[PDB]
Design a binder for this molecule. Structure first.
Ligand code: SRM
Ligand code: SF4
Ligand SMILES: [K+]
Length: 465
């Protein structure tokens, strides 16, 4: 009653879309397509009668789901809508090559990989084991900076677990990408703590052996020496909602989809709308790491026809910058591990946050705000400026002090509190931010600067109070 597709970089054809739309509507309990924050999609509630039909459906359009249980990798991410549009094709080709290279070495724990195009960190590289940060010259990839060892999962009350950001190893020319990817994976395979499953992730391996030790073994196995890191900076993690110009005469329409949940709602036929777009659209779709959808490669002559369907179906309903930059995991009703609501909580929670932002005169601003239903961390709250981590029904740990670009873990601020208490705290804090912030200063950076919360500087040692 849960299927998830392999879909490197989130790129899905309109023929593939029509097939998964038909299956979702006819052969699942919930009737939805759920976009995931690893750039793929899920069905919910597949009856026993429809388990063979769904793998045959995927195969009929060239898709595979083939998970996982004995076979550990997850979907390889790729920046969906780079500002330098010409870089996407090559970066996506490399995400596909890496994905195919790592198809079945049993790993100690699942392993997550990304291809990132600065200045966008939409794929949230610090949540991932292995990250290839693209470096380009003259519109062509020349190589990657490698960052290793991110991961967000924690267990409540267990100070031996922690979220960790990823560590820079150095730069590699493009030709060494697959050798380096294999070397990182096999080093983790060999050095990971297999016995203790809560200690098996690469983030723990790196802390046990040291970054230089792991890096040296990767160099030896890959047959390379890393070069110094080549400069890169991120400016944000959000999607580019609306129309942006791509390559040639093409345009990309990114649609905000709340929680990535695609279903026909009253007066908002989101699912039928996307089907009608799939039937006329000349290009592909791209599922983003923010659970949104890009209608990619629209010729200028077709913009008006695509926008008409999107507007009439509810897919272009205006929301605040705050809502565009908020995210939650699935949680209830389908997740067996859920402690508190996330997806079903987020719309009314952000309604309340929207009122606080307006009350303090910052309705045009945003705070990267995420809700995760339990500390496994799928909603990526442990990279948010404001993160909520489910503890029990209606109760969350409130974390503060991440940043807009996702390079710092937020420390826990208040433990095991309800929504009214969270909103009361955030009302006070957003008020202070609005009045005391420096020009362009984000909410998370402010809570650190103003001494509201201490920063997390070295998570393996200082995440836990
Ligand atoms: C759908 C998604 C959340 C979303 O709203 O988008 C999701 C949903 C679930 N995740 Fe995940 N995870 C999703 C991204 C993540 C991420 C974020 C990311 O990868 O960018 C994390 C934190 C990053 C990390 O791994 O450190 C994440 C860490 C987990 C973990 C904890 C892993 C660990 O190291 O301890 C579990 C539990 C487990 O593996 O035992 C888990 C388990 C689950 C399961 C399958 C629960 C289960 O084991 O039975 C969830 C199914 C819920 C449902 O009913 O659909 N999921 N999960 C994401 C699907 C991504 C995908 O296509 O593969
Ligand atoms: S964070 Fe917990 S509740 Fe949310 S989807 Fe992941 S496992 Fe389920
Ligand atoms: K979304």
């Amino acid at each position: 009653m849960l299927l998830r597709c392999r879909l490197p970089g989130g790129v899905i054809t309109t023929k593939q879309w029509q097939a998964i739309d038909k299956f979702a509507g006819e052969n699942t309990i919930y009737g939805s397509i759920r976009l995931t924050n690893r750039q793929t999609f899920q069905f919910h509630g597949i009856l026993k009668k429809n388990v063979k039909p769904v793998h045959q459906m995927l195969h009929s359009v060239g898709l595979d789901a083939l998970a996982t249980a004995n076979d550990m990798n997850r979907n390889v991410l790729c920046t969906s809508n780079p500002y330098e549009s010409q870089l996407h094709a090559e970066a996506y080709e490399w995400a596909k090559k890496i994905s195919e290279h790592l198809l079945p070495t049993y790993l100690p724990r699942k392993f997550k990989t990304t291809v990132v195009i600065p200045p966008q960190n939409d794929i949230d590289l610090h949540a991932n084991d292995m990250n290839f940060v693209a470096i380009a010259e003259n519109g062509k990839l020349v190589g990657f900076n490698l960052l290793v060892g991110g991961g967000l999962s924690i267990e409540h009350g267990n100070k031996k677990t922690y979220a960790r950001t990823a560590s820079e190893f150095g730069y590699l020319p493009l030709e060494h990408t697959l050798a380096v990817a294999e070397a990182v994976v096999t080093t983790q395979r060999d050095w990971g703590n297999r016995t203790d499953r809560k200690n098996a992730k690469t983030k723990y391996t790196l802390e046990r052996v040291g970054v230089e030790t792991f890096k040296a073994e990767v160099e030896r196995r890959a047959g390379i020496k890393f070069e110094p890191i080549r400069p890169y900076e991120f400016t944000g993690r959000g999607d580019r909602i609306g129309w942006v110009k791509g390559i040639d005469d093409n345009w990309h329409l990114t649609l905000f989809i709340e929680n990535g949940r695609i279903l026909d709602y009253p007066a908002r036929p989101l699912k039928t709308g996307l089907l009608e777009i799939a039937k006329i659209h000349k290009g592909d779709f791209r599922i983003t790491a923010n659970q949104n959808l890009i209608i990619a490669g629209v010729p200028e002559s077709e913009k008006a026809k695509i926008e008409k369907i999107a507007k009439e179906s509810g897919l272009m309903n205006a929301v605040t910058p705050q809502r565009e930059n908020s995210m939650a995991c699935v949680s209830f009703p389908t997740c067996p591990l859920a402690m508190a609501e996330a997806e079903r909580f987020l719309p009314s929670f952000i309604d309340n946050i929207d009122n606080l932002m307006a009350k303090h005169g910052v309705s045009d601003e945003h705070i990267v705000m995420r809700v995760t239903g339990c500390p496994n961390g799928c909603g990526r709250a442990m990279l948010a400026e404001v993160g909520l981590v489910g503890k029990a029904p209606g109760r969350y740990n409130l974390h503060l002090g991440g940043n807009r670009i996702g390079t710092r873990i937020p420390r826990m601020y208040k433990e095991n509190i309800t929504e009214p208490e969270i909103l009361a705290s955030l009302d006070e804090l957003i008020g202070r931010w609005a009045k005391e912030r420096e020009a362009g200063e984000g909410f998370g950076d402010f809570t650190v600067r103003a001494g509201i919360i201490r920063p997390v500087l070295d998570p393996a040692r200082d995440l836990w109070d």
